[PDB]
Amino acid sequence: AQNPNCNIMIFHPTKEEFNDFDKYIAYMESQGAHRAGLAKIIPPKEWKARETYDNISEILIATPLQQVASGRAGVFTQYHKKKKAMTVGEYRHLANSKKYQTPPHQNFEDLERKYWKNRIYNSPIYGADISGSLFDENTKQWNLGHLGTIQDLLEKECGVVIEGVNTPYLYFGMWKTTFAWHTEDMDLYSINYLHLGEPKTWYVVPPEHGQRLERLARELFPGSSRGCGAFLRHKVALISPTVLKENGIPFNRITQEAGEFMVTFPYGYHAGFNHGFNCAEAINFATPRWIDYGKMASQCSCGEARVTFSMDAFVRILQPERYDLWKRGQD
Numbered sequence: 001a002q003n004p005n006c007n008i009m010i011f012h013p014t015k016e017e018f019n020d021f022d023k024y025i026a027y028m029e030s031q032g033a034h035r036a037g038l039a040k041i042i043p044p045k046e047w048k049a050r051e052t053y054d055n056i057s058e059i060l061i062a063t064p065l066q067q068v069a070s071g072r073a074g075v076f077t078q079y080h081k082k083k084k085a086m087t088v089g090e091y092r093h094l095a096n097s098k099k100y101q102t103p104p105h106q107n108f109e110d111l112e113r114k115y116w117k118n119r120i121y122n123s124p125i126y127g128a129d130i131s132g133s134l135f136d137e138n139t140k141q142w143n144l145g146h147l148g149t150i151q152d153l154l155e156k157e158c159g160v161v162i163e164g165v166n167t168p169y170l171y172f173g174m175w176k177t178t179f180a181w182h183t184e185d186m187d188l189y190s191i192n193y194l195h196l197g198e199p200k201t202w203y204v205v206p207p208e209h210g211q212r213l214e215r216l217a218r219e220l221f222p223g224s225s226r227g228c229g230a231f232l233r234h235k236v237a238l239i240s241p242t243v244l245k246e247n248g249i250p251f252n253r254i255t256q257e258a259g260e261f262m263v264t265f266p267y268g269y270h271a272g273f274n275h276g277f278n279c280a281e282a283i284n285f286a287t288p289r290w291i292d293y294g295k296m297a298s299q300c301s302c303g304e305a306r307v308t309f310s311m312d313a314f315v316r317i318l319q320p321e322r323y324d325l326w327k328r329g330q331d
């Protein structure tokens with residue numbers, strides 16, 4: 001079995017290998033990359049996403065979110081407080097202000113120490129889930145707006161034609177902006193491209209060990225667990241690397257820099273934080289290997305998770321027994 005320790009693998013495809021996206025995902029899996037739950041892909045030196053990022057300041061962040069924490073430094077939740085609209089240029093100025101800017105630090109490990117010591121005492125503001133793309137239309141390789149759709153993959157594998165669409169989303173981050181522990185909707189893959197700015201640190205649990213993380217989370221967040229048998233779908237819970245190590249949970253970490261792609265694999269729990277002002281693009285995708293994970297994905301039916309229109313068909317076709325309860329949680 002390849003990659004039996006479930007290490008995060010880093011790939012350097014050539015320009016020729018960058019042509020066929022599906023083929024390269026299958027290649028990474030042949031080398032065991034999925035066992036980690038996360039892989040990094042460094043694009044060939046000849047590739048670029050677009051010409052420049054000099055003209056993005058007028059993008060609107062309609063509903064910036066202030067991420068307010070509760071709990072203790074290593075075990076906390078966050079809620080999202082809505083703020084007034086602002087442009088990307090206004091958000092960048094805010095991220096660089098004395099109140100929000102990255103502190104002085106020695107290296108990524110020092111900044112990680114500072115994040116986990118001090119995150120809860122601040123409330124950073126995030127632009128999230130903004131439909132759109134910063135890939136040039138003429139970028140033909142690894143263009144996250146031109147991928148094969150999940151509806152087409154389900155139709156190809158299973159024969160059923162369904163409604164729904166699959167488009168990318170932009171993220172604008174600042175120091176201490178935080179992504180809570182989660183798997184993707186319907187335990188899909190994700191791909192994330194860091195277009196510009198400061199890094200993102202990621203944490204990930206191997207898919208084969210995801211239930212260990214779920215059991216610790218039920219212990220650490222006992223009221224949330226009574227409220228919902230899939231409360232990690234709410235995307236509000238944080239647990240530090242120190243707490244994970246104290247509890248014997250297998251995980252890995254890596255820092256993504258501008259110009260790099262990350263792929264998350266089905267049922268790979270992940271979390272992380274941004275180092276400073278940045279912009280990322282991400283989308284969900286599927287492969288044949290996903291179908292069995294989609295069929296087994298947990299679901300939230302308590303009302304908290306609320307998701308896109310296009311998830312309806314996935315539940316309806318892959319999880320007909322669960323569909324009526326889940327749809328009620330959507331309504």
Ligand SMILES: O=C(O)CNC(=O)C(=O)O
Nearest residue numbers: 171190191192264280282
């Ligand atoms: O960059 C972001 O805010 C979030 N993206 C991811 O967690 C992902 O691609 O799965």
Ligand SMILES: [Mg+2]
Nearest residue numbers: 056057058059
């Ligand atoms: Mg603009």
Ligand code: NI
Nearest residue numbers: 183184190270
């Ligand atoms: Ni994710």
Ligand SMILES: [Zn+2]
Nearest residue numbers: 228300302304
């Ligand atoms: Zn729920």
